[PDB]
Symmetry: C4
Subunit: 259 residues, 4 copies
């Protein structure tokens, strides 16, 4: 039952000192990979003979490749040990966290098999952001993250209905604004999907101002949309407040009953 | 009392299997019509010999007409059966839902009688958005939609007073901003109705930025308006929170008293 | 004690039928004056021989003068009767409502004494907006306006502290942004008062975008300001919620104890 | 134990009349310094022979230097007396308020030692804003400031987790938006740090509009970001509400138990 010991170490890093040191090393490497990508996209200066500035990941391509190789070796050995200590392979690999880890470390190997044809571009780069979600597994102890997470899980039904009604209101307001503003000169309301942008920006009280109503009817319906946006801001708060109070008191009561 | 059976099927689709299948077919056709309009407004490419791009409903005019004909036949037979199974014709037709359905399927026939003179344009197209409201009748079971709806109905008086006071504050701030900014060069505050737009955009914390105060007094009063907008955002939340908590506990208490 | 009867009619319009009809006439004339000013600022078309469009109050100057004369005669006779039925003249005239009425009907007479020299302009026009506040006395019965008003009166101390801390934070953030952005090219942060505008627009989650940080330090401090603005939006809500719940239950308990 | 008397006067200004008058003098001088800096940055007119307008602190340089000298002498003698009456020198100087006062009055002496080389510029000017924080020590009695401050201290853990999750969401959304919009023409999403600005402006419902998505995928992810911003606005409110209610009732119960 030593594999069970390894899996216990993985699930609860505070059990053994080796578990804690491995968990901290893994968190450090995840943070290093996240910062490495963010910095890699940053455009550094131009070396002599270069017309345009290059990103720190295109000038220092080999250094960032070595760093990514180190991070992916750490992550791969992590996943291999986790699968080896999994009481059930199917049960483990179907969990959301295993999927996140696999899709995080997959674009590296996808690029590896595309190394011979690296001239072509791939969208797999944007999948590296999945490593950021591993940070969340590294920080599941704040005594309030559990409360807020389970509060959102309780709110799921109400917030889903709110999202559905908000989507229907977006369709309605976008239709109204498109038909009010399709006839303006150089108008940005070229269709109802084009007005989806204006409506989602207005009902959230963003107001970029790139799409604004130029007409009078457009302005009337934009005012109605603005007020509906105030209501949109104010609507989830009572639900989350009630569920959070209930869940806080429920967790406290269970704890002190156990106390 | 078979008409009563049909009306029972219409009111509660989960009673019979035929009622459920008809209800699902109706929901599918409503969703198809909504998506059909939204896509119809989308501008597709230009066929050879066409200078300007055409909407998917102007290039594929006949296909979208056939789809609309199918949807309107479904909706018309729905309404005819609903009126035939109505215990009272006047009571049914005066309900808001019958009015919504009638005004949703009316522009189709209005266009039909205007087919001979289809060259002229009509605003009836924008009334097709009423079909979107039928989605709401198709989704009246989420266990929280009833709670939030009846909470808003309870809040009606307070939220109406808040809307009235917000309207009066809009008039006041628009007057002040117009008189502060009427004298600027190329000013957009050409009148007090023109400043209604600036005030309704500022008090909702939108800030498009198309109308901004150029003067110093205009900026002082815009700052006061911004703070009033913070208050506007924060004011309905306590009312909705209190009413929602009360209504949640009331429904729960009634249910468990019946339990 | 007939003057007491008149004052009772004024204070409670529902006592006598004559009181109710006079109160409704007064409300109608107040609304007419408000709409008259708002429409007066609206620019109508240009008559032949006029280069520029004129406001409806500059083209129809005599008609709007007659309407204003009617409204001000009604308001003056109202105030004269109110002072005649006042149990104490000093006590009545020192009330905020008497001051509002006097400053609302004063610019009319100020213009009258300036009729001979009407060529010069005066700011007294913007004081006509005070008549809008009389609407509030005309609508002091909604069963929730009293609750929210007395809730705000209870919150006065906390909301005053919040306004003070918000002002200090505005000074701090404006200083930081000015010193971060004073050196940019064609910068709008020409001083710390100039950055008061940016800070009051950012901390309220308005974001007009007319003043945005162009630098990197400016963007860092603008991000801190944005988060502080989220906190500003979220801070008065708990206070207003707690006070509103307390005041609602207090009024209900007092009423049912009297019931 | 007379030094103890002096320190008691400093800690509680309402004890003696001399303590109260010194405390009010100190508050007056702090406010004078704050207003003096804010006005000093303001650009006044140009005297003859001056091409460009000068700030009130560059034209009236000697007057503002004299005012700053007076304020700094007051603050220095304040700090000297506070250290002389401190029961423990190390304990006093390590408090946050002593640090704030020292860093507030330090740039004055830093400029003094740089008077001979005043041609070079220094960032120490922006540190004068620390004097603003002394206002907060001058206004620690409103009966609600303590409640809100200790409520925020109680919320510290939850709000820290919320800030951490918001930072991770900012990284995720910035990565997605950068990869969606890096390829646009004249795009402002030149890197992931460049999209940190767009994400922090969108998730706070600011919407300056300087950086807006030009693409379709960029607009989809901007809509997701806008909705996440609505959630960001609505998330701290339940936490602050619950903690504020608890802390209000706790302080009230302790007070009336002592009553
Ligand atoms: Hg609440
Ligand atoms: K905004
Ligand atoms: K904007
Ligand atoms: K906002
Ligand atoms: K905005």
């Amino acid at each position: 039952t030593a594999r069970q010991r390894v899996w216990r170490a993985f699930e609860n890093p505070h059990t053994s000192t080796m578990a804690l040191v491995f968990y901290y090393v893994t968190g450090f490497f995840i943070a290093v990979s996240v910062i490495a990508n963010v910095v890699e996209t940053v455009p550094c200066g131009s070396s002599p003979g270069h017309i345009k500035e290059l990103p720190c990941g295109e000038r220092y391509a080999v250094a960032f490749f070595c760093l990514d190789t180190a991070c992916v070796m750490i992550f791969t050995v992590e996943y291999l040990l986790r699968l080896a200590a999994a009481p059930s392979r199917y049960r483990f690999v179907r969990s959301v966290m295993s999927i996140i880890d696999v899709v995080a470390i997959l674009p590296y190997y996808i690029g590896l098999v595309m190394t011979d044809n690296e001239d072509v571009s791939g969208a797999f780069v944007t999948l590296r952001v999945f490593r950021v979600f591993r940070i969340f597994k590294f920080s599941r102890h704040s005594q309030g993250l559990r409360i807020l997470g389970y509060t959102l899980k309780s709110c799921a039904s109400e917030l889903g209905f709110l999202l559905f009604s908000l989507t229907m209101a977006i369709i309605i307001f976008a239709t109204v604004m498109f038909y009010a503003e399709k006839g303006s000169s150089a108008s940005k309301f070229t269709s109802i999907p084009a007005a989806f942008w204006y409506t989602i920006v207005t009902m959230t009280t963003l107001g970029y101002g790139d799409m604004v109503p130029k007409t009078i009817a457009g302005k009337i319906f934009g005012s109605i949309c603005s007020l509906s946006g105030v209501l949109v801001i104010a609507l989830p708060v009572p639900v989350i407040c009630s569920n959070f109070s209930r869940i806080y008191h429920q967790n406290q009561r269970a704890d002190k009953r156990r106390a």
